[PDB]
Subunit: 37 residues, 2 copies
């Protein structure tokens, strides 16, 4: 075992990862779209 | 934190959470602050 719920951890984690990259991207792109005025 | 490499998991997790909301907001605000320049 781990301690409580590690499984759901890796799950929510991985998801948070793809969300962290999708967000980080959409973010940089969100600003890139506006270019450095 | 389990007993392998979950620690960094829970860390990156909770971080990804506060970072997810901090990014989401900082993002919207990042653009809101930018506005159609």
């Amino acid at each position: 075992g781990c301690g409580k719920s590690i499984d759901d951890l890796e799950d929510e984690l991985y998801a948070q990862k793809l969300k962290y990259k999708a967000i980080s991207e959409e973010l940089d792109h969100a600003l890139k779209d506006m270019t450095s005025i």
